[PDB]
PDB file of N, CA and C in Angstrom:
ATOM      1  N   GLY A   1     129.631 213.893   6.722  1.00  0.00           N
ATOM      2  CA  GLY A   1     129.364 215.277   5.830  1.00  0.00           C
ATOM      3  C   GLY A   1     130.081 216.827   6.101  1.00  0.00           C
ATOM      4  N   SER A   2     129.147 217.061   7.394  1.00  0.00           N
ATOM      5  CA  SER A   2     129.492 218.616   7.656  1.00  0.00           C
ATOM      6  C   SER A   2     129.407 219.989   6.607  1.00  0.00           C
ATOM      7  N   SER A   3     129.904 219.221   5.537  1.00  0.00           N
ATOM      8  CA  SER A   3     129.591 220.634   4.332  1.00  0.00           C
ATOM      9  C   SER A   3     130.018 221.928   4.814  1.00  0.00           C
ATOM     10  N   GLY A   4     130.201 222.658   3.838  1.00  0.00           N
ATOM     11  CA  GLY A   4     130.565 224.116   4.110  1.00  0.00           C
ATOM     12  C   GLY A   4     130.462 224.867   2.832  1.00  0.00           C
ATOM     13  N   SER A   5     130.853 225.884   3.066  1.00  0.00           N
ATOM     14  CA  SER A   5     130.642 226.871   1.788  1.00  0.00           C
ATOM     15  C   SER A   5     131.363 228.542   2.126  1.00  0.00           C
ATOM     16  N   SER A   6     131.586 229.172   1.264  1.00  0.00           N
ATOM     17  CA  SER A   6     132.150 230.424   1.189  1.00  0.00           C
ATOM     18  C   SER A   6     131.844 231.666   0.457  1.00  0.00           C
ATOM     19  N   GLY A   7     131.933 232.864   0.707  1.00  0.00           N
ATOM     20  CA  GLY A   7     131.634 233.860  -0.195  1.00  0.00           C
ATOM     21  C   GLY A   7     130.529 234.277  -0.023  1.00  0.00           C
ATOM     22  N   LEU A   8     130.170 235.062   1.398  1.00  0.00           N
ATOM     23  CA  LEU A   8     128.632 235.625   1.629  1.00  0.00           C
ATOM     24  C   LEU A   8     129.131 237.076   1.914  1.00  0.00           C
ATOM     25  N   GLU A   9     128.094 238.022   0.981  1.00  0.00           N
ATOM     26  CA  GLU A   9     128.009 239.398   0.948  1.00  0.00           C
ATOM     27  C   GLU A   9     126.750 239.798   2.054  1.00  0.00           C
ATOM     28  N   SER A  10     126.932 239.901   3.313  1.00  0.00           N
ATOM     29  CA  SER A  10     126.369 240.658   3.760  1.00  0.00           C
ATOM     30  C   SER A  10     125.979 242.188   4.196  1.00  0.00           C
ATOM     31  N   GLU A  11     126.684 242.734   3.362  1.00  0.00           N
ATOM     32  CA  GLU A  11     126.816 244.051   3.086  1.00  0.00           C
ATOM     33  C   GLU A  11     126.200 244.300   1.841  1.00  0.00           C
ATOM     34  N   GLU A  12     124.537 243.983   1.921  1.00  0.00           N
ATOM     35  CA  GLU A  12     124.103 245.041   1.174  1.00  0.00           C
ATOM     36  C   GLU A  12     122.727 245.025   1.087  1.00  0.00           C
ATOM     37  N   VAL A  13     122.485 246.532   1.323  1.00  0.00           N
ATOM     38  CA  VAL A  13     121.187 246.855   1.658  1.00  0.00           C
ATOM     39  C   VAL A  13     120.816 247.977   0.928  1.00  0.00           C
ATOM     40  N   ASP A  14     119.467 248.290   0.713  1.00  0.00           N
ATOM     41  CA  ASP A  14     118.948 249.208  -0.107  1.00  0.00           C
ATOM     42  C   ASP A  14     117.933 250.009   1.016  1.00  0.00           C
ATOM     43  N   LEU A  15     117.429 251.409   0.310  1.00  0.00           N
ATOM     44  CA  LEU A  15     116.594 252.111   1.135  1.00  0.00           C
ATOM     45  C   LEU A  15     115.171 251.885  -0.029  1.00  0.00           C
ATOM     46  N   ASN A  16     115.200 252.624  -0.929  1.00  0.00           N
ATOM     47  CA  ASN A  16     113.764 252.923  -1.916  1.00  0.00           C
ATOM     48  C   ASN A  16     114.030 251.486  -2.853  1.00  0.00           C
ATOM     49  N   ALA A  17     114.899 250.758  -3.356  1.00  0.00           N
ATOM     50  CA  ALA A  17     115.349 250.247  -4.465  1.00  0.00           C
ATOM     51  C   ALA A  17     114.930 248.893  -3.425  1.00  0.00           C
ATOM     52  N   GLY A  18     114.603 248.601  -2.361  1.00  0.00           N
ATOM     53  CA  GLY A  18     114.176 247.723  -1.285  1.00  0.00           C
ATOM     54  C   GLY A  18     112.361 247.568  -1.152  1.00  0.00           C
ATOM     55  N   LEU A  19     112.190 248.929  -1.618  1.00  0.00           N
ATOM     56  CA  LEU A  19     110.627 249.108  -1.961  1.00  0.00           C
ATOM     57  C   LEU A  19     110.046 249.140  -2.956  1.00  0.00           C
ATOM     58  N   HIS A  20     110.793 249.422  -4.205  1.00  0.00           N
ATOM     59  CA  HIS A  20     110.502 249.389  -5.458  1.00  0.00           C
ATOM     60  C   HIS A  20     110.499 248.178  -6.237  1.00  0.00           C
ATOM     61  N   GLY A  21     111.789 247.599  -6.076  1.00  0.00           N
ATOM     62  CA  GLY A  21     111.585 246.101  -6.761  1.00  0.00           C
ATOM     63  C   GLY A  21     112.595 246.336  -7.936  1.00  0.00           C
ATOM     64  N   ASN A  22     113.684 245.418  -8.193  1.00  0.00           N
ATOM     65  CA  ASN A  22     114.014 245.213  -9.334  1.00  0.00           C
ATOM     66  C   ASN A  22     114.012 244.138  -9.905  1.00  0.00           C
ATOM     67  N   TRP A  23     112.508 244.303 -10.460  1.00  0.00           N
ATOM     68  CA  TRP A  23     112.127 243.074 -11.287  1.00  0.00           C
ATOM     69  C   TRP A  23     111.868 243.463 -12.565  1.00  0.00           C
ATOM     70  N   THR A  24     112.555 243.058 -13.570  1.00  0.00           N
ATOM     71  CA  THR A  24     112.596 243.308 -15.056  1.00  0.00           C
ATOM     72  C   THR A  24     111.900 242.013 -15.630  1.00  0.00           C
ATOM     73  N   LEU A  25     111.041 242.511 -16.517  1.00  0.00           N
ATOM     74  CA  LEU A  25     110.795 241.265 -17.450  1.00  0.00           C
ATOM     75  C   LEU A  25     111.605 240.053 -17.607  1.00  0.00           C
ATOM     76  N   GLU A  26     112.743 240.200 -17.326  1.00  0.00           N
ATOM     77  CA  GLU A  26     113.999 239.567 -18.042  1.00  0.00           C
ATOM     78  C   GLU A  26     113.944 238.591 -16.578  1.00  0.00           C
ATOM     79  N   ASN A  27     114.464 239.593 -15.420  1.00  0.00           N
ATOM     80  CA  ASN A  27     114.671 238.934 -14.112  1.00  0.00           C
ATOM     81  C   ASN A  27     113.366 237.784 -13.619  1.00  0.00           C
ATOM     82  N   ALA A  28     112.144 238.496 -13.702  1.00  0.00           N
ATOM     83  CA  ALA A  28     111.063 238.095 -13.270  1.00  0.00           C
ATOM     84  C   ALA A  28     110.886 236.333 -13.930  1.00  0.00           C
ATOM     85  N   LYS A  29     111.302 236.438 -15.295  1.00  0.00           N
ATOM     86  CA  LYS A  29     111.377 235.367 -15.799  1.00  0.00           C
ATOM     87  C   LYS A  29     112.066 234.175 -15.114  1.00  0.00           C
ATOM     88  N   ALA A  30     113.162 234.637 -15.914  1.00  0.00           N
ATOM     89  CA  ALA A  30     114.535 233.472 -14.795  1.00  0.00           C
ATOM     90  C   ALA A  30     114.053 233.295 -13.626  1.00  0.00           C
ATOM     91  N   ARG A  31     113.719 234.758 -12.796  1.00  0.00           N
ATOM     92  CA  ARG A  31     113.205 234.051 -11.299  1.00  0.00           C
ATOM     93  C   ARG A  31     112.172 232.916 -11.104  1.00  0.00           C
ATOM     94  N   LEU A  32     111.034 233.213 -12.041  1.00  0.00           N
ATOM     95  CA  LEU A  32     110.105 232.110 -12.366  1.00  0.00           C
ATOM     96  C   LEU A  32     110.909 230.953 -12.116  1.00  0.00           C
ATOM     97  N   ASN A  33     111.331 230.605 -13.339  1.00  0.00           N
ATOM     98  CA  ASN A  33     111.783 229.519 -13.612  1.00  0.00           C
ATOM     99  C   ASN A  33     112.607 229.094 -12.441  1.00  0.00           C
ATOM    100  N   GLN A  34     113.332 229.865 -11.714  1.00  0.00           N
ATOM    101  CA  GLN A  34     114.551 229.666 -10.589  1.00  0.00           C
ATOM    102  C   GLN A  34     113.474 229.394  -9.756  1.00  0.00           C
ATOM    103  N   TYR A  35     112.266 229.880  -9.417  1.00  0.00           N
ATOM    104  CA  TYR A  35     110.932 229.243  -8.250  1.00  0.00           C
ATOM    105  C   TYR A  35     111.083 228.218  -8.713  1.00  0.00           C
ATOM    106  N   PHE A  36     110.931 227.637  -9.939  1.00  0.00           N
ATOM    107  CA  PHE A  36     110.127 226.095 -10.098  1.00  0.00           C
ATOM    108  C   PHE A  36     111.457 225.414  -9.928  1.00  0.00           C
ATOM    109  N   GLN A  37     112.726 225.887 -10.031  1.00  0.00           N
ATOM    110  CA  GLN A  37     113.916 224.839 -10.011  1.00  0.00           C
ATOM    111  C   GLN A  37     114.216 224.840  -8.620  1.00  0.00           C
ATOM    112  N   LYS A  38     114.281 225.918  -7.851  1.00  0.00           N
ATOM    113  CA  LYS A  38     114.666 225.428  -6.207  1.00  0.00           C
ATOM    114  C   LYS A  38     113.479 224.374  -5.666  1.00  0.00           C
ATOM    115  N   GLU A  39     111.932 225.308  -5.939  1.00  0.00           N
ATOM    116  CA  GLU A  39     111.154 224.327  -5.413  1.00  0.00           C
ATOM    117  C   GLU A  39     111.138 222.441  -6.049  1.00  0.00           C
ATOM    118  N   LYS A  40     111.482 222.902  -7.149  1.00  0.00           N
ATOM    119  CA  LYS A  40     111.517 221.511  -8.033  1.00  0.00           C
ATOM    120  C   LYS A  40     110.254 221.510  -8.741  1.00  0.00           C
ATOM    121  N   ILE A  41     109.262 222.826  -8.438  1.00  0.00           N
ATOM    122  CA  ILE A  41     107.902 222.671  -9.196  1.00  0.00           C
ATOM    123  C   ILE A  41     107.790 222.228 -10.839  1.00  0.00           C
ATOM    124  N   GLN A  42     107.015 222.625 -11.383  1.00  0.00           N
ATOM    125  CA  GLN A  42     106.953 222.408 -12.778  1.00  0.00           C
ATOM    126  C   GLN A  42     105.791 223.637 -13.090  1.00  0.00           C
ATOM    127  N   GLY A  43     106.167 224.107 -13.752  1.00  0.00           N
ATOM    128  CA  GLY A  43     105.145 225.169 -14.582  1.00  0.00           C
ATOM    129  C   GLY A  43     106.132 225.540 -16.218  1.00  0.00           C
ATOM    130  N   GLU A  44     104.377 225.732 -16.719  1.00  0.00           N
ATOM    131  CA  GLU A  44     104.977 225.781 -18.468  1.00  0.00           C
ATOM    132  C   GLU A  44     103.962 227.157 -18.739  1.00  0.00           C
ATOM    133  N   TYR A  45     104.125 227.532 -19.935  1.00  0.00           N
ATOM    134  CA  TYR A  45     103.508 228.664 -20.569  1.00  0.00           C
ATOM    135  C   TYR A  45     102.606 228.035 -21.649  1.00  0.00           C
ATOM    136  N   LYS A  46     101.301 228.844 -21.744  1.00  0.00           N
ATOM    137  CA  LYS A  46     100.123 228.615 -22.646  1.00  0.00           C
ATOM    138  C   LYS A  46     100.005 230.071 -23.726  1.00  0.00           C
ATOM    139  N   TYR A  47     100.968 229.279 -25.009  1.00  0.00           N
ATOM    140  CA  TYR A  47     100.494 230.248 -25.800  1.00  0.00           C
ATOM    141  C   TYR A  47      99.640 229.926 -26.970  1.00  0.00           C
ATOM    142  N   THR A  48      98.694 231.090 -26.990  1.00  0.00           N
ATOM    143  CA  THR A  48      97.684 230.784 -27.781  1.00  0.00           C
ATOM    144  C   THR A  48      97.518 232.068 -28.825  1.00  0.00           C
ATOM    145  N   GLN A  49      97.781 231.445 -29.910  1.00  0.00           N
ATOM    146  CA  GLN A  49      97.805 232.021 -31.175  1.00  0.00           C
ATOM    147  C   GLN A  49      96.387 232.718 -31.741  1.00  0.00           C
ATOM    148  N   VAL A  50      96.677 234.023 -31.927  1.00  0.00           N
ATOM    149  CA  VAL A  50      95.281 234.812 -32.218  1.00  0.00           C
ATOM    150  C   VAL A  50      95.663 235.439 -33.444  1.00  0.00           C
ATOM    151  N   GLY A  51      94.501 236.287 -33.809  1.00  0.00           N
ATOM    152  CA  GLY A  51      94.533 237.321 -35.358  1.00  0.00           C
ATOM    153  C   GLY A  51      94.988 236.131 -36.469  1.00  0.00           C
ATOM    154  N   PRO A  52      95.217 236.945 -37.352  1.00  0.00           N
ATOM    155  CA  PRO A  52      95.252 236.563 -38.935  1.00  0.00           C
ATOM    156  C   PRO A  52      96.845 236.747 -38.965  1.00  0.00           C
ATOM    157  N   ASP A  53      97.623 235.586 -39.713  1.00  0.00           N
ATOM    158  CA  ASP A  53      98.895 235.010 -39.827  1.00  0.00           C
ATOM    159  C   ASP A  53      99.978 236.622 -40.081  1.00  0.00           C
ATOM    160  N   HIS A  54      99.406 237.283 -41.055  1.00  0.00           N
ATOM    161  CA  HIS A  54      99.973 238.418 -41.257  1.00  0.00           C
ATOM    162  C   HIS A  54     100.187 239.157 -40.240  1.00  0.00           C
ATOM    163  N   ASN A  55      99.275 239.080 -38.896  1.00  0.00           N
ATOM    164  CA  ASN A  55      99.554 239.901 -37.849  1.00  0.00           C
ATOM    165  C   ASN A  55      98.637 239.252 -36.639  1.00  0.00           C
ATOM    166  N   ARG A  56      99.637 238.196 -36.141  1.00  0.00           N
ATOM    167  CA  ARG A  56      99.011 237.295 -35.186  1.00  0.00           C
ATOM    168  C   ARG A  56      99.771 237.719 -33.796  1.00  0.00           C
ATOM    169  N   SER A  57      99.245 236.945 -32.777  1.00  0.00           N
ATOM    170  CA  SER A  57     100.122 237.102 -31.608  1.00  0.00           C
ATOM    171  C   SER A  57      99.609 235.912 -30.781  1.00  0.00           C
ATOM    172  N   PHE A  58     100.684 235.199 -29.808  1.00  0.00           N
ATOM    173  CA  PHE A  58     100.305 234.466 -28.907  1.00  0.00           C
ATOM    174  C   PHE A  58     100.761 234.693 -27.421  1.00  0.00           C
ATOM    175  N   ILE A  59      99.175 234.494 -27.035  1.00  0.00           N
ATOM    176  CA  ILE A  59      98.838 234.899 -25.961  1.00  0.00           C
ATOM    177  C   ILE A  59      99.251 233.804 -25.224  1.00  0.00           C
ATOM    178  N   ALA A  60     100.709 233.709 -24.330  1.00  0.00           N
ATOM    179  CA  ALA A  60     101.082 233.643 -23.261  1.00  0.00           C
ATOM    180  C   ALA A  60     100.437 233.315 -21.996  1.00  0.00           C
ATOM    181  N   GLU A  61      99.914 232.189 -21.480  1.00  0.00           N
ATOM    182  CA  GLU A  61      99.237 232.705 -20.310  1.00  0.00           C
ATOM    183  C   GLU A  61      99.832 231.472 -19.031  1.00  0.00           C
ATOM    184  N   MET A  62      99.963 231.503 -18.132  1.00  0.00           N
ATOM    185  CA  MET A  62     100.525 230.716 -16.990  1.00  0.00           C
ATOM    186  C   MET A  62      99.799 230.928 -15.694  1.00  0.00           C
ATOM    187  N   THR A  63      99.672 229.538 -15.095  1.00  0.00           N
ATOM    188  CA  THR A  63      99.138 229.769 -14.136  1.00  0.00           C
ATOM    189  C   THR A  63      99.503 228.668 -12.922  1.00  0.00           C
ATOM    190  N   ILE A  64     100.149 229.343 -11.611  1.00  0.00           N
ATOM    191  CA  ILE A  64     100.341 228.695 -10.601  1.00  0.00           C
ATOM    192  C   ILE A  64     100.037 228.594  -9.410  1.00  0.00           C
ATOM    193  N   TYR A  65     100.050 227.565  -8.070  1.00  0.00           N
ATOM    194  CA  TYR A  65      99.286 227.715  -7.085  1.00  0.00           C
ATOM    195  C   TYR A  65     100.293 227.884  -5.928  1.00  0.00           C
ATOM    196  N   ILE A  66     100.107 228.455  -5.062  1.00  0.00           N
ATOM    197  CA  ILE A  66     101.138 228.588  -4.234  1.00  0.00           C
ATOM    198  C   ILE A  66     100.124 228.064  -2.767  1.00  0.00           C
ATOM    199  N   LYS A  67     100.954 226.765  -2.071  1.00  0.00           N
ATOM    200  CA  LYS A  67     100.160 226.277  -1.264  1.00  0.00           C
ATOM    201  C   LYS A  67     100.528 226.887   0.001  1.00  0.00           C
ATOM    202  N   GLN A  68     101.829 227.614   0.152  1.00  0.00           N
ATOM    203  CA  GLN A  68     102.170 228.346   1.451  1.00  0.00           C
ATOM    204  C   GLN A  68     101.132 229.488   1.617  1.00  0.00           C
ATOM    205  N   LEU A  69     100.549 229.628   0.596  1.00  0.00           N
ATOM    206  CA  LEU A  69      99.650 230.712   0.519  1.00  0.00           C
ATOM    207  C   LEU A  69      98.172 230.191   0.545  1.00  0.00           C
ATOM    208  N   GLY A  70      98.133 229.099  -0.185  1.00  0.00           N
ATOM    209  CA  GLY A  70      96.333 228.691  -0.058  1.00  0.00           C
ATOM    210  C   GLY A  70      96.009 228.586  -1.366  1.00  0.00           C
ATOM    211  N   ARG A  71      96.336 229.455  -1.926  1.00  0.00           N
ATOM    212  CA  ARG A  71      96.034 230.388  -3.030  1.00  0.00           C
ATOM    213  C   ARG A  71      96.548 230.259  -4.582  1.00  0.00           C
ATOM    214  N   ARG A  72      96.322 230.544  -5.509  1.00  0.00           N
ATOM    215  CA  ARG A  72      97.165 230.737  -6.835  1.00  0.00           C
ATOM    216  C   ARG A  72      96.848 231.830  -7.724  1.00  0.00           C
ATOM    217  N   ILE A  73      97.685 232.155  -8.530  1.00  0.00           N
ATOM    218  CA  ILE A  73      97.942 232.981  -9.079  1.00  0.00           C
ATOM    219  C   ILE A  73      97.874 232.816 -10.951  1.00  0.00           C
ATOM    220  N   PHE A  74      96.908 233.508 -11.375  1.00  0.00           N
ATOM    221  CA  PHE A  74      96.810 233.226 -13.010  1.00  0.00           C
ATOM    222  C   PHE A  74      97.454 234.486 -13.783  1.00  0.00           C
ATOM    223  N   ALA A  75      97.955 234.203 -15.156  1.00  0.00           N
ATOM    224  CA  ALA A  75      98.376 235.055 -15.830  1.00  0.00           C
ATOM    225  C   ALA A  75      98.111 235.185 -17.260  1.00  0.00           C
ATOM    226  N   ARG A  76      97.863 236.000 -18.194  1.00  0.00           N
ATOM    227  CA  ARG A  76      97.292 235.649 -19.556  1.00  0.00           C
ATOM    228  C   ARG A  76      97.758 237.274 -20.374  1.00  0.00           C
ATOM    229  N   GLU A  77      98.767 237.161 -20.893  1.00  0.00           N
ATOM    230  CA  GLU A  77      99.256 238.368 -21.613  1.00  0.00           C
ATOM    231  C   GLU A  77      99.215 238.023 -23.345  1.00  0.00           C
ATOM    232  N   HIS A  78      99.976 239.115 -24.031  1.00  0.00           N
ATOM    233  CA  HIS A  78      99.938 239.029 -25.393  1.00  0.00           C
ATOM    234  C   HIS A  78     100.926 239.552 -25.852  1.00  0.00           C
ATOM    235  N   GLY A  79     102.127 239.014 -25.632  1.00  0.00           N
ATOM    236  CA  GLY A  79     103.131 239.430 -26.430  1.00  0.00           C
ATOM    237  C   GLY A  79     103.591 239.083 -27.769  1.00  0.00           C
ATOM    238  N   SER A  80     104.728 239.972 -27.811  1.00  0.00           N
ATOM    239  CA  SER A  80     104.917 239.540 -29.213  1.00  0.00           C
ATOM    240  C   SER A  80     105.229 237.983 -29.811  1.00  0.00           C
ATOM    241  N   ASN A  81     106.579 237.541 -29.227  1.00  0.00           N
ATOM    242  CA  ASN A  81     107.077 236.644 -29.557  1.00  0.00           C
ATOM    243  C   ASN A  81     106.852 235.664 -28.346  1.00  0.00           C
ATOM    244  N   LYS A  82     106.990 233.960 -28.402  1.00  0.00           N
ATOM    245  CA  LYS A  82     106.808 233.404 -27.282  1.00  0.00           C
ATOM    246  C   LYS A  82     107.731 233.699 -26.021  1.00  0.00           C
ATOM    247  N   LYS A  83     108.801 234.333 -26.369  1.00  0.00           N
ATOM    248  CA  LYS A  83     109.807 235.137 -25.427  1.00  0.00           C
ATOM    249  C   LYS A  83     108.883 236.394 -24.619  1.00  0.00           C
ATOM    250  N   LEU A  84     108.790 237.006 -25.321  1.00  0.00           N
ATOM    251  CA  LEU A  84     107.865 238.422 -24.659  1.00  0.00           C
ATOM    252  C   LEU A  84     106.776 237.616 -24.193  1.00  0.00           C
ATOM    253  N   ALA A  85     105.982 237.292 -24.733  1.00  0.00           N
ATOM    254  CA  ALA A  85     104.517 236.981 -24.212  1.00  0.00           C
ATOM    255  C   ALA A  85     104.884 236.179 -23.023  1.00  0.00           C
ATOM    256  N   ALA A  86     105.803 235.670 -22.969  1.00  0.00           N
ATOM    257  CA  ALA A  86     106.456 234.599 -21.714  1.00  0.00           C
ATOM    258  C   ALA A  86     107.015 235.373 -20.705  1.00  0.00           C
ATOM    259  N   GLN A  87     107.798 236.284 -21.171  1.00  0.00           N
ATOM    260  CA  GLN A  87     108.340 236.875 -20.099  1.00  0.00           C
ATOM    261  C   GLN A  87     107.380 237.732 -19.532  1.00  0.00           C
ATOM    262  N   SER A  88     106.390 238.536 -19.705  1.00  0.00           N
ATOM    263  CA  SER A  88     105.188 239.486 -19.487  1.00  0.00           C
ATOM    264  C   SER A  88     104.401 238.869 -18.596  1.00  0.00           C
ATOM    265  N   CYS A  89     103.947 237.320 -18.994  1.00  0.00           N
ATOM    266  CA  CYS A  89     103.588 236.292 -18.262  1.00  0.00           C
ATOM    267  C   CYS A  89     104.179 235.936 -17.271  1.00  0.00           C
ATOM    268  N   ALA A  90     105.376 235.477 -17.077  1.00  0.00           N
ATOM    269  CA  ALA A  90     106.330 235.397 -15.850  1.00  0.00           C
ATOM    270  C   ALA A  90     106.161 236.381 -14.975  1.00  0.00           C
ATOM    271  N   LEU A  91     106.428 237.882 -15.245  1.00  0.00           N
ATOM    272  CA  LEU A  91     106.325 239.133 -14.452  1.00  0.00           C
ATOM    273  C   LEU A  91     105.075 238.908 -14.342  1.00  0.00           C
ATOM    274  N   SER A  92     104.011 238.547 -14.800  1.00  0.00           N
ATOM    275  CA  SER A  92     102.963 238.873 -14.277  1.00  0.00           C
ATOM    276  C   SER A  92     102.645 238.065 -12.733  1.00  0.00           C
ATOM    277  N   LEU A  93     102.864 236.574 -12.992  1.00  0.00           N
ATOM    278  CA  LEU A  93     103.418 235.912 -11.752  1.00  0.00           C
ATOM    279  C   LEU A  93     103.887 236.328 -10.825  1.00  0.00           C
ATOM    280  N   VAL A  94     105.251 236.886 -11.449  1.00  0.00           N
ATOM    281  CA  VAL A  94     106.091 237.455 -10.318  1.00  0.00           C
ATOM    282  C   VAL A  94     105.619 238.903  -9.410  1.00  0.00           C
ATOM    283  N   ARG A  95     104.918 239.798 -10.275  1.00  0.00           N
ATOM    284  CA  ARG A  95     104.349 240.858  -9.550  1.00  0.00           C
ATOM    285  C   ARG A  95     103.650 240.472  -8.550  1.00  0.00           C
ATOM    286  N   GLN A  96     102.737 239.558  -8.915  1.00  0.00           N
ATOM    287  CA  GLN A  96     101.627 238.950  -7.996  1.00  0.00           C
ATOM    288  C   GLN A  96     102.251 238.145  -6.818  1.00  0.00           C
ATOM    289  N   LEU A  97     103.129 237.291  -7.125  1.00  0.00           N
ATOM    290  CA  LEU A  97     103.887 236.539  -6.036  1.00  0.00           C
ATOM    291  C   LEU A  97     104.437 237.626  -5.260  1.00  0.00           C
ATOM    292  N   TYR A  98     105.342 238.546  -5.517  1.00  0.00           N
ATOM    293  CA  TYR A  98     105.596 239.582  -4.449  1.00  0.00           C
ATOM    294  C   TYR A  98     104.706 240.442  -3.970  1.00  0.00           C
ATOM    295  N   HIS A  99     103.554 240.137  -4.236  1.00  0.00           N
ATOM    296  CA  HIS A  99     102.010 241.010  -3.842  1.00  0.00           C
ATOM    297  C   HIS A  99     101.494 240.261  -2.831  1.00  0.00           C
ATOM    298  N   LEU A 100     101.148 239.070  -3.044  1.00  0.00           N
ATOM    299  CA  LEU A 100     100.791 238.183  -2.077  1.00  0.00           C
ATOM    300  C   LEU A 100     101.577 237.864  -0.861  1.00  0.00           C
ATOM    301  N   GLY A 101     103.305 237.702  -1.304  1.00  0.00           N
ATOM    302  CA  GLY A 101     104.241 237.456   0.029  1.00  0.00           C
ATOM    303  C   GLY A 101     104.831 236.372  -0.282  1.00  0.00           C
ATOM    304  N   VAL A 102     105.225 236.279  -1.540  1.00  0.00           N
ATOM    305  CA  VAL A 102     105.914 234.720  -1.726  1.00  0.00           C
ATOM    306  C   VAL A 102     107.531 235.098  -2.231  1.00  0.00           C
ATOM    307  N   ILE A 103     107.712 235.949  -3.276  1.00  0.00           N
ATOM    308  CA  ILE A 103     109.179 236.187  -3.229  1.00  0.00           C
ATOM    309  C   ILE A 103     109.310 237.587  -2.606  1.00  0.00           C
ATOM    310  N   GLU A 104     110.899 238.295  -3.314  1.00  0.00           N
ATOM    311  CA  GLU A 104     111.344 239.370  -2.431  1.00  0.00           C
ATOM    312  C   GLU A 104     112.051 240.249  -3.403  1.00  0.00           C
ATOM    313  N   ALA A 105     111.855 241.658  -3.407  1.00  0.00           N
ATOM    314  CA  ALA A 105     112.683 242.676  -3.856  1.00  0.00           C
ATOM    315  C   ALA A 105     113.719 241.470  -4.423  1.00  0.00           C
ATOM    316  N   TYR A 106     114.144 242.064  -5.521  1.00  0.00           N
ATOM    317  CA  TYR A 106     115.972 241.693  -6.399  1.00  0.00           C
ATOM    318  C   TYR A 106     116.528 242.660  -5.905  1.00  0.00           C
ATOM    319  N   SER A 107     117.964 242.007  -5.862  1.00  0.00           N
ATOM    320  CA  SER A 107     119.094 242.950  -5.657  1.00  0.00           C
ATOM    321  C   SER A 107     120.108 243.311  -6.678  1.00  0.00           C
ATOM    322  N   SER A 108     119.767 243.302  -7.838  1.00  0.00           N
ATOM    323  CA  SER A 108     120.215 243.069  -9.202  1.00  0.00           C
ATOM    324  C   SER A 108     121.166 244.333  -8.833  1.00  0.00           C
ATOM    325  N   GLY A 109     122.475 243.672  -8.935  1.00  0.00           N
ATOM    326  CA  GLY A 109     123.601 244.672  -8.500  1.00  0.00           C
ATOM    327  C   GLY A 109     123.644 245.562  -7.029  1.00  0.00           C
ATOM    328  N   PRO A 110     124.662 246.082  -6.577  1.00  0.00           N
ATOM    329  CA  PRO A 110     124.940 246.595  -5.360  1.00  0.00           C
ATOM    330  C   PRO A 110     123.947 248.117  -5.428  1.00  0.00           C
ATOM    331  N   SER A 111     122.699 247.815  -5.287  1.00  0.00           N
ATOM    332  CA  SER A 111     121.889 248.495  -5.423  1.00  0.00           C
ATOM    333  C   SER A 111     122.081 249.870  -6.528  1.00  0.00           C
ATOM    334  N   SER A 112     121.434 250.788  -6.932  1.00  0.00           N
ATOM    335  CA  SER A 112     121.672 251.840  -7.991  1.00  0.00           C
ATOM    336  C   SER A 112     121.215 253.222  -7.548  1.00  0.00           C
ATOM    337  N   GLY A 113     122.562 253.824  -6.795  1.00  0.00           N
ATOM    338  CA  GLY A 113     122.061 255.170  -6.209  1.00  0.00           C
ATOM    339  C   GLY A 113     123.639 255.289  -5.904  1.00  0.00           C
TER     340      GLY A 113
END
């Protein structure tokens, strides 16, 4: 086996951006899916249609449990489309994850400054 790899950039550090956290509805979303892909975990979103047709909304709610923490975080937003709602939902869990101490600030690009 042995295995090998190349292309390591150990020259990427931030100052405040490291505290702020580059977690965009988009990132969070993907990230979420990423977390489920890496860990191989399984988690979906629960879209609940409310209001009238003319003006309805799909409440995208999602819940995940962290064993490394011993607890679980739940989310329930009311975005526009499955995508939106979902996104918000994700970011919801993401924000929490980063709060509890599961994920870590993002490095979307070589910092911004």
